[PDB]
Amino acid sequence: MYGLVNKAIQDMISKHHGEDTWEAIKQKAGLEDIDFFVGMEAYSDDVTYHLVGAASEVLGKPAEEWLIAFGEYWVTYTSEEGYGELLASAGDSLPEFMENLDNLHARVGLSFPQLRPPAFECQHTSSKSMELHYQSTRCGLAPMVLGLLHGLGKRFQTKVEVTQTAFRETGEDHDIFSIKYED
Ligand code: HEM
């Protein structure tokens, strides 16, 4: 993934647990030689998955739990590190934002030429619920999606209830979530 993602990971760990913890995680992930991540540079996805795994071990959290926190963090990170207006432009409610997400990544993809963005499709079941289809070229990121949804809930001051109903890993087509939301 682009370096931006790996910077966000470093920033979250550093902010929440301090530099020493970050250094131990970076070492454990096999990344000691990397002085810094370059935000607009493409990295092997392996870099990210190794950080997740190292973080899980060092912190003693399940990786899924950690990815949820990271997904929630991304919503704040992007808004603060150069993508605040882009985020704002994607809307002011959760369902509108999710409808706009493919278009938001299309916009990101203008600047990040090698982007492999997720694809999100909403099927609205009422004015307060939807089925969310999450399609990706990557494995294992559903828990990050769960966190992202909670970050968006906070962003829009909306209570979000999210349950995963289909699993990419289990050999189903793609991840699906049922979501209820209320002001
Ligand atoms: C301005 C805000 C955002 C920016 C600039 C941004 C940018 C990016 C970038 C650079 C990647 C890495 C993909 C790659 O390197 O090929 C990515 C991946 C991803 N993004 Fe966005 N993103 C933003 C907001 C969001 C939000 C709000 C969501 C909420 C669902 C989201 C969902 C995801 C997911 C789930 C991935 C994992 C990649 C995958 O599933 O294959 N992003 N994004």
The one-letter amino acid code at 117 reads P
Asked if residues 78 and 152 have their Cβ atoms less than 8 Å apart, the reply is no
User: For residue 151, which atom of ligand 1 is closest to its CA?
Assistant: 27
Phi then psi for residue 124, to 5 deg, are -80, 130
Fold of 1-183: H-NOX domain (3.90.1520)
Q: Could you tell me the two tokens for 64?
A: 């899924």
Tell which one of 4, 40, 45, 74 to mutate to probe ligand 1, the residue whose CB is within 8 A of the most ligand atoms.
74
- List the determination method: X-ray
Tell which one of 40, 49, 105, 120 to mutate to probe ligand 1, the residue whose CB is within 8 A of the most ligand atoms.
105
Which residues on adjacent β-strands are paired with residue 130? 124, 179
Unique residue bearing structure tokens 């432009």: 89
Pocket lining: 115 vs ligand 1, CB cutoff 6 Å: yes
DSSP string computed for 91-156: -SSHHHHHHHHHHHHHHHHHHSTT----EEEEEEEETTEEEEEEE-SSSS-HHHHHHHHHHHHHHT
The one-letter amino acid code at 71 reads G
Cα–Cα distance between 127 and 112 in angstroms, integer?
34
Per the annotation, binding residues for heme b are 2, 74, 105, 116, 134, 136, 138
**Looking at ligand 1, which residue's alpha carbon is closest to its atom 3?**
78
Structural domain spans, the chain: 1-183
First to last CA, the chain: 34
Provide long-range contacts, Cβ within 8 A and 24+ apart, for 46-50: 47/1, 47/6, 48/1, 48/5, 48/6, 48/9, 49/140
